[PDB]
Amino acid sequence: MFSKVLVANRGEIAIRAFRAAYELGVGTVAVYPYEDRNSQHRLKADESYQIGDIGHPVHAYLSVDEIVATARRAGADAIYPGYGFLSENPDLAAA
Amino acid sequence: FIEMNPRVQVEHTVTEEITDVDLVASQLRIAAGETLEQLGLRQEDIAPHGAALQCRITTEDPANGFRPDTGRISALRTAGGAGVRLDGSTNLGAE
Amino acid sequence: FIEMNPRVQVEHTVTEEITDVDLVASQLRIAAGETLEQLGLRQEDIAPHGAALQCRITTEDPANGFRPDTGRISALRTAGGAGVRLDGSTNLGAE
Numbered sequence: 665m666f667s668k669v670l671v672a673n674r675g676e677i678a679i680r681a682f683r684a685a686y687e688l689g690v691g692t693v694a695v696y697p698y699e700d701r702n703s704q705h706r707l708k709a710d711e712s713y714q715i716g717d718i719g720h721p722v723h724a725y726l727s728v729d730e731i732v733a734t735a736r737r738a739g740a741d742a743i744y745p746g747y748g749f750l751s752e753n754p755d756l757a758a759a
Numbered sequence: 760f761i762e763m764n765p766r767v768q769v770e771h772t773v774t775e776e777i778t779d780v781d782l783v784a785s786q787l788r789i790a791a792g793e794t795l796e797q798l799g800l801r802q803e804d805i806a807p808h809g810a811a812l813q814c815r816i817t818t819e820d821p822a823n824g825f826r827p828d829t830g831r832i833s834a835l836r837t838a839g840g841a842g843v844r845l846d847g848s849t850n851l852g853a854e
Numbered sequence: 855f856i857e858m859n860p861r862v863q864v865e866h867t868v869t870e871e872i873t874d875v876d877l878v879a880s881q882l883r884i885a886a887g888e889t890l891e892q893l894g895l896r897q898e899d900i901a902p903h904g905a906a907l908q909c910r911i912t913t914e915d916p917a918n919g920f921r922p923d924t925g926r927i928s929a930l931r932t933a934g935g936a937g938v939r940l941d942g943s944t945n946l947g948a949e
Contacts, residue, residue, distance in 0.1 A: 665788070669787070676847035681783060684781070684783040702854070704849075704850070744787075745766070746767075747769065752765065781936065808903065839940050840939075841867070841870060844936070844938070845934050846934070846935070851946065
């Protein structure tokens with residue numbers, strides 16, 4: 665199966681994805697903005713990274729290139745959208 | 760035939776309680792190149808049994824409009840028992 | 855036929871997960887003078903489906919013997935998700 669997976673989402677869906685991945689023996693990677701450093705999903709993953717600038721926390725999650733670069737740097741093999749954010753944006757699939 | 764949502768919603772757990780089939784793990788295994796034959800998901804042993812329902816708890820005030828309210832949580836007591844499932848959990852002192 | 859326990863144990867939940875029949879409420883209704891006819895507990899629709907298991911978490915130290923350890927709880931993080939049931943819950947700062 666996949667060696668590592670990156671979840672580009674926030675909240676309980678990220679924790680559900682992490683639990684499902686751990687049940688399958690797959691590593692997990694998380695991304696968070698500065699304003700959301702106190703979320704639980706940050707400490708539920710094996711590795712966490714900070715994305716975006718010092719403002720616009722919502723726009724940080726809507727950045728295909730940054731997420732792709734972070735996944736490439738972390739050696740991930742898959743990206744899980746979840747629901748909401750870039751879950752139905754074709755640019756993510758194209759990238 | 761209003762439309763077709765090409766993703767997973769927040770209500771899938773409801774069907775997970777009647778068909779006892781994992782959705783996210785099956786999705787991840789399908790993305791890895793598995794068919795619905797080694798997974799055992801074939802259509803002669805899928806039968807619902809029981810009923811189920813789901814509700815969501817928000818910070819909206821039903822008194823002043825329905826706008827969200829922000830603050831620090833000063834007391835949290837959860838629940839559980841027979842036939843109860845909880846998704847998402849905050850902590851004491853959260854903002 | 856080692857013996858017969860005339861009470862309810864701490865493991866009944868396990869059968870409650872396969873036969874989805876309430877035990878304590880049925881016991882209370884039986885004590886009120888009800889038969890197993892209005893309750894619907896007749897033996898042609900009782901069939902187990904799935905598997906289940908139960909474990910108990912104690913303060914016993916597997917390092918020094920197995921004696922209990924007393925103290926104040928300084929951190930509690932629970933769990934949950936699909937197919938998880940929790941019975942009994944302490945709180946932060948408990949003794």
